[PDB]
Coordinates of C-alpha atoms and ligand atoms in Angstrom, one line a residue:
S1 CA 104.8 70.5 92.9
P2 CA 103.6 74.2 93.1
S3 CA 106.2 76.8 94.2
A4 CA 105.8 79.0 97.3
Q5 CA 105.2 82.1 95.0
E6 CA 102.7 80.2 92.9
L7 CA 100.8 79.2 96.1
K8 CA 100.8 82.8 97.3
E9 CA 99.3 83.9 93.9
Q10 CA 96.7 81.1 94.2
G11 CA 95.9 82.4 97.7
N12 CA 95.5 86.0 96.4
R13 CA 93.2 84.8 93.6
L14 CA 91.1 82.8 96.0
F15 CA 90.9 85.8 98.4
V16 CA 89.6 88.0 95.5
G17 CA 87.1 85.2 94.8
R18 CA 85.8 85.3 98.5
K19 CA 87.1 81.8 99.3
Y20 CA 88.8 82.8 102.5
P21 CA 89.5 79.3 104.2
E22 CA 90.9 78.0 100.9
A23 CA 93.0 81.1 100.4
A24 CA 94.4 80.7 104.0
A25 CA 95.3 77.1 103.3
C26 CA 97.2 78.2 100.2
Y27 CA 99.2 80.7 102.2
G28 CA 99.9 78.0 104.7
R29 CA 101.3 75.8 101.9
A30 CA 103.4 78.8 100.8
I31 CA 104.8 79.2 104.4
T32 CA 105.6 75.4 104.4
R33 CA 107.7 75.9 101.3
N34 CA 109.3 79.1 102.5
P35 CA 108.5 80.4 106.0
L36 CA 110.7 83.5 105.8
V37 CA 108.4 85.7 103.5
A38 CA 106.4 88.2 105.4
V39 CA 103.7 88.7 102.8
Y40 CA 102.4 85.1 103.2
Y41 CA 101.6 85.9 106.9
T42 CA 100.1 89.3 106.2
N43 CA 97.8 87.9 103.5
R44 CA 96.9 84.9 105.6
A45 CA 96.1 87.3 108.5
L46 CA 93.5 89.1 106.3
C47 CA 91.9 85.7 105.6
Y48 CA 91.7 85.0 109.3
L49 CA 90.1 88.4 109.9
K50 CA 87.4 87.6 107.3
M51 CA 87.0 84.2 109.0
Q52 CA 86.5 85.9 112.5
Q53 CA 89.7 84.2 113.7
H54 CA 91.1 87.3 115.4
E55 CA 93.6 85.6 117.6
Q56 CA 95.2 83.7 114.5
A57 CA 95.1 87.0 112.5
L58 CA 97.0 88.8 115.4
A59 CA 99.6 86.0 115.5
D60 CA 100.2 86.1 111.7
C61 CA 100.6 89.9 111.8
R62 CA 103.2 89.4 114.6
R63 CA 105.1 86.8 112.5
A64 CA 105.0 89.2 109.5
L65 CA 106.4 92.0 111.6
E66 CA 109.3 89.9 112.9
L67 CA 110.3 89.4 109.2
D68 CA 109.5 92.8 107.8
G69 CA 109.3 95.5 110.5
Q70 CA 108.6 98.2 107.9
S71 CA 105.5 96.4 106.5
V72 CA 102.7 98.9 105.9
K73 CA 100.3 96.0 105.3
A74 CA 101.2 94.2 108.6
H75 CA 100.6 97.3 110.6
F76 CA 97.4 98.2 108.8
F77 CA 95.9 94.7 109.0
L78 CA 96.9 94.5 112.7
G79 CA 95.2 97.8 113.3
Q80 CA 92.0 96.6 111.6
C81 CA 92.1 93.4 113.6
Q82 CA 92.6 95.2 116.9
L83 CA 89.8 97.6 116.0
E84 CA 87.4 94.6 115.6
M85 CA 88.7 93.3 119.0
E86 CA 88.0 96.7 120.7
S87 CA 91.7 97.2 121.5
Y88 CA 91.3 100.8 120.4
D89 CA 94.5 102.4 121.5
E90 CA 96.6 99.7 119.9
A91 CA 94.5 99.8 116.7
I92 CA 94.9 103.6 116.4
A93 CA 98.7 103.4 117.0
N94 CA 99.1 100.6 114.4
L95 CA 97.0 102.6 111.8
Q96 CA 99.0 105.7 112.5
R97 CA 102.2 103.7 112.0
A98 CA 100.9 102.3 108.7
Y99 CA 100.2 105.8 107.6
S100 CA 103.8 107.1 108.5
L101 CA 105.4 104.0 106.8
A102 CA 103.2 104.5 103.7
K103 CA 104.3 108.2 103.5
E104 CA 108.0 107.2 103.9
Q105 CA 107.7 104.5 101.3
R106 CA 105.8 106.8 98.8
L107 CA 102.8 104.3 98.8
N108 CA 99.4 105.7 97.7
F109 CA 96.2 104.1 99.1
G110 CA 94.1 107.2 98.5
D111 CA 92.3 108.2 101.7
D112 CA 92.2 104.6 103.0
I113 CA 94.5 105.0 106.1
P114 CA 93.1 108.4 107.3
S115 CA 89.6 107.0 106.7
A116 CA 90.4 103.9 108.8
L117 CA 91.9 106.2 111.5
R118 CA 88.7 108.3 111.7
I119 CA 86.6 105.1 112.0
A120 CA 88.8 103.7 114.8
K121 CA 88.9 107.0 116.7
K122 CA 85.1 107.5 116.3
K123 CA 84.5 104.0 117.6
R124 CA 86.9 104.5 120.6
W125 CA 85.2 107.8 121.3
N126 CA 81.7 106.4 121.2
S127 CA 82.9 103.5 123.5
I128 CA 84.3 106.1 126.0
Ligands
LIG1 O1 94.8 95.3 101.1 C1 94.4 96.2 100.5 N1 93.6 96.1 99.4 N2 93.4 94.8 98.9 C2 92.2 94.1 99.0 O2 91.2 94.5 99.5 N3 92.4 92.9 98.5 C3 93.7 92.7 98.0 C4 94.2 91.5 98.8 C5 94.8 90.4 97.9 C6 95.1 89.1 98.8 C7 95.0 89.4 100.3 C8 95.8 90.7 100.6 C9 95.3 91.9 99.9 C10 94.4 94.0 98.3 O3 95.5 94.4 98.1 C11 94.5 97.6 101.0 C12 93.5 98.6 100.8 N4 93.9 99.7 101.4 C13 95.1 99.5 102.1 C14 95.8 100.3 102.9 F1 95.4 101.6 103.1 C15 96.9 99.9 103.5 F2 97.7 100.7 104.3 C16 97.4 98.6 103.3 F3 98.4 98.2 103.9 C17 96.6 97.8 102.6 F4 97.0 96.5 102.4 C18 95.4 98.2 101.9

């Protein structure tokens, strides 16, 4: 009955409403209808990160990257996920790649990506 795009929009709305497991199930329904849309996996990965399901978030970022290798969001959310998992070198490389892709695509996220990079590099530094 609902379309894949309607389910993705319901998932986005539920995510803004802090209903992360419900949002993730909507994105799963969207994938069921159309499994070749990267943004359904990137957005579900952010749900999984909020739900502390890091392995599932990593897997969704990987599926998104197979579909859209230039995705700024897939690299950024993968970097944030890796940072929480203490995989610092990979996290920094993915955040740096999100920054380079955002600049190439003329996307403006304010200071979000350099801010995330400093947080990851400071955490890596403190750990070493
Ligand atoms: O996701 C970001 N914001 N955002 C939220 O917090 N809530 C919505 C949310 C709606 C449904 C789930 C997916 C997103 C949203 O779009 C970003 C903020 N700064 C970024 C950033 F620097 C990136 F490089 C990037 F790739 C980014 F995606 C972001």
